[PDB]
Design an enzyme around this catalytic site. Structure first.
Site: not given
Ligand SMILES: [N-]=[N+]=NCCNc1c2c(nc3ccccc13)CCCC2
Ligand SMILES: C#CCCCCC[n+]1c(-c2ccccc2)c2cc(N)ccc2c2ccc(N)cc21
Ligand SMILES: [N-]=[N+]=NCCNc1c2c(nc3ccccc13)CCCC2
Lengths: 534, 538
Positions: A200, A325, A438
C-alpha cells in the site's frame, strides 16, 4: 552472555534476543536507533543520523510507534485493531528491527527490507503481521523493517521552506536504507543484495525510492504490493501540500514559513492529529491529508512523468494486487456500507458513492464511471451495485495505477513479474462481501500460517510456504521461480505485448493475460482526456 | 372479357384490373402488379405530396411490374450479383407510384391478414419489383395477402425546403401512406382484411415503418409492425429542417439553380432527373458511410418532433412490434468508403486505418467522442491485431447505425406499453457472393422471410428451405395474432416478448430458437447513454 546476540554496528554495541520460531531459533535485534529522535526543533525536519552510544544497547524489544491517528470506529474488533499501534505512540520513533537466522549466516545473505502501509498516516514495523521470524528461520533471510514518520510529522510540507520541506518520512526510510548498507554485514546480510518490499503506502514508498536517484544506490530489487508512486492518492502538488499545511496551521491557532512552522512545533502531537483529517479538499475515501509532495527534490517531477521517462534497465520488480482492493474503504465513508450488514446498496447510493470514491471527477467523468461499471442487464441489482462500488475504488486507486506502472517499467527495460492474490484468510473477521481486502496477503508472505497456534488451515500453511519461496527467490535472484523445481508452471515476466500475470491462490499458479485491460484503458487512457479537454 | 380467367378480374376504387396467374413451388398465386395509386408525380408535381390516382376507363393491365422510381444505379462492381441484385430491374422513371398485390389462387373466401412491404435503400434507392421481395411464396404457402409499393427516393422523394408549399419534404413517406390508404379502401376486393394490416420493412423501409408508428395520420392504417435492421431514431434516418434546407440549397447551386423558395424549386423542377441524381451525393456535410443526402426531415408535420423525442414520450399501449438485426449490419458500408476495405481481399486493416475509419463511420463525432469509440472497441490485449481491428470497424458502423438504435427503440416501446419481440438473424446464405469476412450483411435475411429457398431452382440447401418455412411462419403468425409463436406447437421453443427487465431476444439461425438476454447491452449503453452526453458537454 550469547555471542550470537552480540553485534557491533558503526554506532556501538547491541544485544538482541533469541526468539523461537516453529522450526527453530532466530536472532532478533529490535528497536535499533537509526536517527536522532525527530523531536522539538527537529519536528518536520529531515532525519539526522543517530550519534554513537556507550556500552551495550538493549535491542530485545520493539520501540515506540510514530505518533499517529488510532482507529476507534470498531473497538475490540480484530479487523481494525490488528493495524492499530501495539507500542507507545511517540515522536521519538526512528528505530529499526533486524531478524537473522540463528546462528548468524555463514556467508552473506540477501536482505529483505519491509516498508509498511497505512495511507502515510499510520503503521508500525512492530505489528504481528510484519514478524520477520518465519522468513529468517525458514528461508534463511535477513529481514529489516523500520519505523518512518507518518501524518503531519512525516509529510507536512511548506514547499521551499528549509524548516518543513516535506517527504521527511521518506528520508527516514532512506536513512534506514543507508544504515542497512553500512551495518547489515555485521548481521550476515549482503549489502549487495537488498530487496525493498512494501504494501500500500509502503509499496508507493518503494516506488518513490525507484524514482529518486539518491535511493537507487541503496537497493537492487523491489516488491510493490497493492500500491504505486503514480496514482490519485500517493502524492500531492507543492501547491496542495502548502494549502493543507496552511489550513492545519490555521486550525491549531498558528497565524513567513519560519513563523508558521515554529508555532506548529509548539503544538502537542495530539493537537496536530486531532485536525489532520479536516484539511482534505472534498468528501472522499482513499485520500490522505499528508502524503509525499512533488517537491522538485526527492521527486524531481511527478511519478507519472518519472515512470514515462525513466530508464529501468538494470531493475527487477514484483508487482501485484489483492482480489478486493477497495472493499475496506467503503465501510469508512460511503453511505450504505457496513461491516455488519451485506451492504446491498441502491442505484442512488452507487451514484453518490462514485462521487466520494472518485472525488476529482467532474459530473461528466462520474457519469462515464457509472455507465462503465453498471451491468446494463441488472442495473438496479444491489449485489452488482455493491461489488461495482468496490471495483471503482479498487481499480481507480490500485489495480489500474499498478497496470500503468507494470506497463511503463516493462517498456523501459525493467524485468517485471505481476500477480493477483485471490485467497481470503480462513481466520478473516471482515464480512464475506469484502472478499480479500487490502493487506490480507501480508500474513501469508511473512509466513504467519507456519505458527500452529494461529489456527490457519493446512492448505494455508503450504500456501504461505509457497509465497515465502516466491518472495525470497525474487530477493535472491530477481526471479520468483524455483531453479531447483522443474514443472511448476513457471511464472512468466509481465510484458507490454503479452501482459502476463499469475494468480496466487490455493490452486497451483495459473497464467492470465491482461490485468483488467479494458477497464484500465478507461482509467489510464480515457478519463485523463475527460478531466483535461473539459 | 369472356375468354379471360374469371379469377383475375378485380375492380378497385379507380377501376378494373387484370392480374396474372403466377406459378409458385406449391401451386398458383394471383398477382396484380403495377396498380397505380397516385397521379404520376411529374412536371410541376415533382417534390410535391402525391395526389390520389384519378379513376381510369376499361380494364387496366396489372400483369407486369411498373417503373422503378428515379434513382442512383450502383456500377461499382459490374456483373457482381452482390451489388446488382439490389439494382433496378425495371425502367427508371419519375412516373413510378404503383403498387403490387399477391394473394392465394383462387382468392381467399374469408378476410385474410395483409402484409405490406416497404423496401430499404438508404431513402435513395430500391423498388418493390426486386426478386427478393417476391410475395408469391408468402401468398401460396401462408395464404397471405401481400402488398408492396414504390415510393419516391432521393431528391424526388426527400428534397425539402422546410416551410415551403412546393417542396415540404417527406413526400416519399406520403407516397407510402397513400399506398396504405389504398389498402384500407381496396384490399377487401382481393380478399384481404383491412382490419388486420401489418407493415414490414427493412433498413430505410424499417425506418419508414417506424415513422408511420410515430405519425398519427398513419396509425389508423395499420395494426402491427416489423422493423428489420432499421429504426426512425438514429444517426441517419432523419435530418433537421436546417440541414435539409442546407442540402437542398447546395444541390440547387450544383445544378445551376440560384438561391425565395418558389424561384429555387421552380428551377429544380426544370432540371432533368439524371442531373439531380448526378449531384445527390455531393451535398453530405462530411466524408461518411451510412449517411444519405435526402432522407425524412423533422418538419413539425409528418414528424411533430424528432423520432428520439417521440419514442421517449409516446403511448404505444395497443401496439405489437417485431424488431431485429443481422449478425453484421456494418460490413457492407466499409467496402464503400473506408480505406483499407475491399470485397476482393480479407480487409485486414492497421490501427491508423481503424482510427481513420472511426471518423468516417461516426462523422458527427468530435475528437474526444471518436477516442471514446476507439478505446471502447480496441482489444487492449491485441490492439494492433488486423482481424480484430477489421471486425471492430464493422461493429462500430453496425452498432452505431442499427443495433443500438434498435436496442433503444425496443427498450422505449417496451417501457411504454408495447408488446415487443426482438431477434438477431445469424445465418449466412450458402449462395452469398460477398466475402466470408462480411458475415451476414444488411438485407441478407429478406430472401428467407419472403421464402425464396422454397424455389428449387434457386440452389439453397434443404436446411435453408426448412429455415425459410420457419421464418415465414414467425412473420405471418405475428401478422395474424401479434405473436410469432405457433399455438398448436408447444414444446417447440417459444419466443418470449422483449421486456425492459429481462431484455430477451432470440437467435434466428439453422439451430432451433435460442433465447438470449441483453441486446449488446454494455456497448449500447455507451452509444445510447454516454456518447450523447459527450456531445451535450464538450
Ligand atoms: N488506508 N488506511 N489504512 C489504515 C486502516 N488499517 C488497515 C491497513 C491495511 N489493511 C486494512 C484492511 C482492512 C481494514 C483496515 C486496514 C493495509 C496496511 C495499512 C493499514
Ligand atoms: C464530402 C462528402 C461526402 C462523402 C460520402 C459520400 C460518398 N459518395 C460520393 C462522393 C465522393 C466524394 C465527395 C462527395 C461525394 C459519390 C460521388 C459521385 N459523383 C457519385 C456517387 C457517389 C457515391 C455513391 C454511393 C455512396 N454510398 C457514396 C458516394
Ligand atoms: N444502403 N444502400 N445500399 C445500396 C446497396 N443496396 C443494398 C441494399 C441492402 N443490402 C445490401 C447489402 C449489400 C450490398 C448492397 C445492399 C438492404 C436493402 C436495401 C438496399
Amino acid at each position: 552472555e550469547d555471542p550470537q546476540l552480540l553485534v557491533r554496528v558503526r554506532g556501538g554495541q547491541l544485544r538482541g534476543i533469541r526468539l523461537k520460531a516453529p522450526g527453530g531459533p532466530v536472532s532478533a535485534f529490535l528497536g535499533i536507533p537509526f536517527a536522532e529522535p525527530p523531536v522539538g526543533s527537529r519536528r518536520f525536519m529531515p532525519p539526522e543520523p543517530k550519534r554513537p552510544w556507550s556500552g551495550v544497547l538493549d535491542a530485545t524489544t520493539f520501540q515506540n510507534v510514530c505518533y499517529q491517528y488510532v482507529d476507534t470506529l470498531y473497538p475490540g474488533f480484530e479487523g481494525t485493531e490488528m493495524w492499530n499501534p501495539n507500542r507507545e505512540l511517540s515522536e521519538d520513533c526512528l528505530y529499526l528491527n533486524v531478524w537473522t537466522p540463528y546462528p548468524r549466516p555463514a556467508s552473506p545473505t540477501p536482505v529483505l527490507i519491509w516498508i509498511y502501509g497505512g495511507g502515510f498516516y499510520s503503521g508500525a514495523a512492530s505489528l504481528d503481521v510484519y514478524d520477520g521470524r518465519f522468513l529468517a528461520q525458514v528461508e534463511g533471510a535477513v529481514l529489516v523493517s523500520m519505523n518512518y514518520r507518518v501524518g503531519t510529522f512525516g509529510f507536512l510540507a511548506l514547499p521551499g521552506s528549509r524548516e518543513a520541506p516535506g517527504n521527511v518520512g521518506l528520508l527516514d526510510q532512506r536513512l534506514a536504507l543507508q544504515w542497512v548498507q553500512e551495518n547489515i554485514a555485521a548481521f550476515g546480510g549482503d549489502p549487495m543484495s537488498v530487496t525493498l518490499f512494501g504494501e500500500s503506502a509502503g509499496a508507493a514508498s518503494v516506488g518513490m525510492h525507484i524514482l529518486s536517484l539518491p535511493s537507487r544506490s541503496l537497493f537492487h530489487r523491489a516488491v510493490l504490493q497493492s500500491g504505486t508512486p503514480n496514482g490519485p492518492w500517493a502524492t500531492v502538488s507543492a501547491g496542495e501540500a502548502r494549502r493543507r499545511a496552511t489550513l492545519l496551521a490555521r486550525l491549531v491557532g498558528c497565524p513567513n514559513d519560519t513563523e508558521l512552522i515554529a508555532c506548529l512545533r509548539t503544538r502537542p502531537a495530539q493537537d496536530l492529529v486531532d485536525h489532520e483529517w479536516h484539511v482534505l479538499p472534498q468528501e472522499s475515501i482513499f485520500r490522505f491529508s499528508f502524503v509525499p509532495v512533488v517537491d522538485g527534490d526527492f521527486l524531481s517531477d511527478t511519478p507519472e512523468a518519472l515512470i514515462n521517462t525513466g530508464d529501468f534497465q538494470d531493475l527487477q520488480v514484483l508487482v501485484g494486487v489483492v482480489k478486493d482492493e477497495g472493499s475496506y474503504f467503503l465501510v469508512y465513508g460511503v453511505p450504505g456500507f457496513s461491516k455488519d450488514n451485506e451492504s446491498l446498496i441502491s442505484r442512488a447510493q452507487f451514484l453518490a458513492g462514485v462521487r466520494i470514491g472518485v472525488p476529482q471527477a467532474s459530473d461528466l467523468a462520474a457519469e462515464a464511471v457509472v455507465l462503465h461499471y453498471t451491468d446494463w442487464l441488472h442495473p438496479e441489482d444491489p449485489t452488482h451495485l455493491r461489488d461495482a462500488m468496490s471495483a471503482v475504488v479498487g481499480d481507480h486507486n490500485v489495480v489500474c495505477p499498478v497496470a500503468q506502472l507494470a506497463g511503463r517499467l516493462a517498456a523501459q527495460g525493467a524485468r517485471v513479474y505481476a500477480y493477483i492474490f485471490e485467497h481470503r484468510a480462513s481466520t478473516l473477521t471482515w464480512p464475506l462481501w469484502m472478499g480479500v481486502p487490502h493487506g490480507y496477503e501480508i500474513e501469508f508472505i511473512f509466513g504467519l500460517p507456519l505458527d500452529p497456534s494461529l489456527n490457519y488451515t493446512t492448505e494455508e500453511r503450504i500456501f504461505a510456504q509457497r509465497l515465502m519461496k516466491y518472495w525470497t527467490n525474487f530477493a535472491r535472484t530477481g526471479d520468483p521461480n524455483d531453479p531447483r523445481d522443474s514443472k511448476s508452471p513457471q511464472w512468466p515476466p509481465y510484458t507490454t505485448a503479452a501482459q502476463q500475470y499469475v494468480s496466487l491462490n490455493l490452486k497451483p499458479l495459473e497464467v492470465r493475460r491482461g490485468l483488467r485491460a479494458q477497464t484500465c484503458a478507461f482509467w489510464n487512457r480515457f478519463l485523463p482526456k475527460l478531466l483535461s479537454a473539459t
